[PDB]
From a paper:
DOCK (dedicator of cytokinesis) proteins activate Rho family GTPases to regulate development, autoimmunity and bone homeostasis and they are involved in cancer and severe developmental and immune-related diseases. DOCK proteins are characterized by the presence of a DHR2 domain of about 400 amino acids that carries the GDP/GTP nucleotide exchange (GEF) activity, and an upstream DHR1 domain that binds membrane phosphoinositides. Here we focused on the DHR2 domain of human [name] and analyzed the mechanisms of its inhibition by these chemical compounds. Finally, we used SAXS analysis of DOCK5DHR2 and crystallographic analysis of unbound [name]-GDP to gain insight into structural features of the inhibitory mechanism of C21.
To investigate structural features in [name] and [name] that could be susceptible to allosteric modulation by C21, we used synchrotron SAXS coupled to size exclusion chromatography (SEC-SAXS) to analyze the structure of DOCK5DHR2 and of the DOCK5DHR2-[name] complex in solution, and X-ray crystallography to determine the structure of [name]-GDP. Thus, while a region important for establishing functional interactions, the switch 2 is formally not a switch region in [name] and it can readily engage the C lobe of the DHR2 domain. In contrast, residues 30GEY32 in the switch 1 of unbound [name]-GDP are poorly ordered, which drives a unique conformation of the switch 1 that has not been seen in other [name] structures. When superposed to the [name]/Dock2DHR2 complex, the switch 1 of [name]-GDP lacks contacts with α6-β3 in the B lobe while residues 35TVF37 in the switch 1 conflict with the catalytic nucleotide sensor in the C lobe. We identified two such features: an unexpected conformational dynamics in DOCK5DHR2 that diminishes upon [name] binding, and a unique conformation of the switch 1 in unbound [name]-GDP not seen in any of its other conformational states. In this model, the C lobe of DOCK5DHR2 features conformational dynamics that allows [name]-GDP to bind in successive steps: first, Rac-GDP docks onto the C lobe by its structurally invariant switch 2 region; then, the dynamics of the C lobe brings the switch 1 in contact with the B lobe; finally, this interaction remodels the switch 1 to stabilize the complex, making way for the nucleotide sensor to reach into the nucleotide-binding site and promote the dissociation of GDP. This model suggests an allosteric mechanism in which C21 takes advantage of these dynamical features to stall [name] in an abortive conformation where it can still bind the switch 2 of [name]-GDP but cannot escort it to the B lobe. Crystals were obtained in 0.1 M MES pH 6.5 and 20% PEG 3350. The structure was solved by molecular replacement with Phaser39 using [name]-GPPNHP28 as a model.
Author numbering: 2 to 177
Write the structure that this text describes.
Amino acid sequence: QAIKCVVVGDGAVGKTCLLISYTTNAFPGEYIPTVFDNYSANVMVDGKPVNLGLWDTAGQEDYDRLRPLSYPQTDVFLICFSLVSPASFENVRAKWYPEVRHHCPNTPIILVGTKLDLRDDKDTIEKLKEKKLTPITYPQGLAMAKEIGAVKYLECSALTQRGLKTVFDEAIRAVL
Ligand SMILES: Nc1nc2c(ncn2[C@@H]2O[C@H](COP(=O)(O)OP(=O)(O)O)[C@@H](O)[C@H]2O)c(=O)[nH]1
Ligand SMILES: [Mg+2]
């Protein structure tokens, strides 16, 4: 069974790094591909082989009209936000969940918090504190998930690859 998973969220949340890390088994560092592409993974999680088509999107305001053109035939969505970006977290309820439901009202959602490795980073915490902001905690993320009716809430880091295999395993689990 061939599954289709669309990845949505704000620019710089780490969507492309997440997809390259997972499929390639490596963090793309500084040079991240700039072409918005689709990826694939042949994975079997307690069954027979499954091909997971992974679709990256152009998250910026400029693509608001063209982005939903990749949504038709989608099996599951990954709404992404930076755990070290409250602006991207508010955009879950503000932008991403209304837009996903607009075009696909019955399609399952997995809420994904990225840059998990930066949540304990002293420099990142200091920068946020100056702007009177705090990183998103697991209870905050889980509440937003339940609010936006997400099937599951998951955290990960494409840098350390921690929680990454789970994200796409649960994407398959939200389908089937
Ligand atoms: N520390 C850390 N940096 C990351 C992670 N994922 C992406 N990045 C960085 O975050 C920025 C955004 O990456 P990118 O995939 O292009 O974001 P996109 O616009 O959502 O696709 C880049 O500077 C990446 O190097 C992560 O899990 N942890
Ligand atoms: Mg990208």
